Amino acid sequence: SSQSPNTPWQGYDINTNYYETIPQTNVVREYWFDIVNTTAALDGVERPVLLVNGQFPGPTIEANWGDTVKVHVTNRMENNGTAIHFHGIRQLYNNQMDGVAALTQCPVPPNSSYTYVWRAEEYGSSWYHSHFSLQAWEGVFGGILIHGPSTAEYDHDLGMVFLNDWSHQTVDEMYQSVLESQNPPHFQTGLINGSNIWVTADNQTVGRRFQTEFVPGQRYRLRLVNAAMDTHFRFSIDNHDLTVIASDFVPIVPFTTNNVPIGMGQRYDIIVTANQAPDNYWIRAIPQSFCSDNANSDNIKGVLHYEGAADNSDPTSTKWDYGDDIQCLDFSLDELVPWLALDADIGGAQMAESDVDFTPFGDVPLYLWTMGGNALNISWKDPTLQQTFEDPDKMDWKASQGVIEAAIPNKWTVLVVQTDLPVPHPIHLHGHDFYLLAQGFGQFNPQNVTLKTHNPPRRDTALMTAATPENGGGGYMVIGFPADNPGVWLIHCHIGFHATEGFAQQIVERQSEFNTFFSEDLLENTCDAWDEYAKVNPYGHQYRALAGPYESGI
Ligand SMILES: *[C@@H]1O[C@H](CO)[C@@H](O[C@@H]2O[C@H](CO)[C@@H](O)[C@H](O)[C@H]2NC(C)=O)[C@H](O)[C@H]1NC(C)=O
Ligand SMILES: [O-][O-]
Ligand SMILES: [Cu+2]
Ligand SMILES: [Cu+2]
Ligand SMILES: [Cu+2]
16 A cells, blocks of 8 residues: 555556556546437538537546446447447457447347446546447547556646547548548548647638647646548647657656657557647647548648737747658557567467458458458457357358457467558557567568567557658568457457448457356347337448448447
8 A cells, every 4th residue: 555645546546457466446437428410510510520528529438547437338329330339448258348349249229229338447547439440530439548657747637639520511421532542541631639620611611629738847748649531740848848658558757759640540649748848839730641531731720829919810830850751660669668578479379461452342442451371251240259258169260251260268369460552550459468478561561570579568459550652562460469358359450430341350369268248138139129220220231342331230
């Protein structure tokens, strides 16, 4: 009880192994989420959105390390199912609460509910979002903020800072055109924590920029989350240094930088000290042009307003000269050093490789992303956990199910995700923080690659980097994780369009121990409701063909 005195995690600290030890708080944080169909004018232009409780971003789930969180999700829409995923939450022996349509549950139909219950067995910053088709990017997402230890001190916690791309047509409206094109999706603008201005065709300014206020001398924590559909950002604040203290849910040895490159699904916790002359400073979220197509890359900005700065007055500050805003990169392996030091014990690991390609299918054609040789093609109404309940020793996986088996308790898997294309992708794994062993450009060399096993970066989302066409294209990333968590775990590109097109596989982990978590009633109650919806509403039927809005299932 000498550690972290007068905190909810008294008896534990920054050195506690949070994979093995959790504070007991006895506390349950209970949330009620209505998923609603509405409109909003987040940058001053009205359009349809799907929201949690009428808010964008959705309300923050806030808890202390070791709490239990209970989220009652009710579907108040007409024409979508829903499922809510808690990104980066380990869900240890709790796979059926992971919120993945077609894996861990059927979708929740309109007028039905699902109660997610999970343990805060990590601390730091993340987010929840729909894991049903493109719905997260219609606005169904919000923060997860779990208080706990930190690797540097500060005075004020500003909470979540979401980074989003945005357009005035919806992602669902765009989807058919995306499917039928070899060009990446184009977005018109972006939002910082759900706000921006917009310049109209007649040069009027509508909307309002994100703004935050600093007291000179004070230190502020910002919890950055990239929730964009198809944009890799560099975040910066003119004239201010940023001290990075965590990557995803893993506290790291702090380091200071002038910008944070942040991929879709990733989080970084930063501390900013108000040590500049009192003034207004631009906060910038800049799409990286190699892998983002945005009409307004230089106008996704907010305002840092010091007390002492002019009111009603935009910044005139200059961007940090950190180089170009072209490549889509992570912090390097040597920059991200987990504070809790753990080695990747990959002796005796199972080795796998999943290639990434983009291929035409059918007569239109539709251009689909494939991972490990197949575009994922699975079933909302027949989720993987139903298949294994019906047949506990099932071995007859279809190619289109994209299965990677990890049957042996605690045995490591080393997975190489590779591509020949000049296109990078943020790779996210459910149910695990993976160990990031390598990340590179060009061809993967099985002889020459060095794997970092000595306290490598550890997180839940990392880029498969790729070279530009002039440098030959292609790239790879290599991850390691032990089979410490029975369940069916999605591994996929965190670009929504890509995952829905097929860029996803499923890790079937310790299949013989699904009894540790599985509830037939929790599965079938929702599946039965979903079937009743599908009878009366065409949106209840999954489009799985090649002349319409193909849905991979996730
Ligand atoms: C970004 O938007 C979120 C969601 O509205 C804001 O969340 C608040 O965060 C603070 C600090 O953790 C909490 O006190 C509030 O309860 C949250 N409100 C919610 C979730 O409705 C967040 O403050 C915004 N970020 C900034 C920097 O303004
Ligand atoms: O995050 O999926
Ligand atoms: Cu996830
Ligand atoms: Cu992708
Ligand atoms: Cu996911």
